[PDB]
DNA sequence: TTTTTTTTTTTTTTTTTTTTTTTTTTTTTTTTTTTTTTTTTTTTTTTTTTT
């Protein structure tokens, strides 16, 4: 299979629920400096699992949308992919 | 004009100092080990709350 398309709640500057458009056989994530582009890595680091330490935050409070400014959202946050492969 | 006297320059000798080079010794930062402590994360029971 292949990597479809994945979906963001919350989770390092993207408030709300999106859905990020689906994936053709080999894409590009462009897009102007601090515009922050890295952090979908970051997600896709986290749902895949990566130890927090490498996560370039400490103590995985900050992670919610807003908290290394000093207020947070909620206390949730929701990344998920959805892997399509061979068999419908 | 020639002879006699003075002074400056050039060059060699020497002596003291400086530099160099190696060698041997020493003592120091560097590198590795072990420990071990902290902090973050985890769990599980307790507590709180909801139907
Ligand atoms: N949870 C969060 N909520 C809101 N803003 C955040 C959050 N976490 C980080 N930020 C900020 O939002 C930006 C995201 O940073 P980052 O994801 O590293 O961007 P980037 O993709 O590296 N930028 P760039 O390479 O210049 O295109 C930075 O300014 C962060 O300080």
Redesign the pocket.
Known sequence: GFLKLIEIENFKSYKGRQIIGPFQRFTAIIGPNGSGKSNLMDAISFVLGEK?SNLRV???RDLIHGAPVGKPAANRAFVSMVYSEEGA
């Open positions: 927090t400490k103590t995985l």
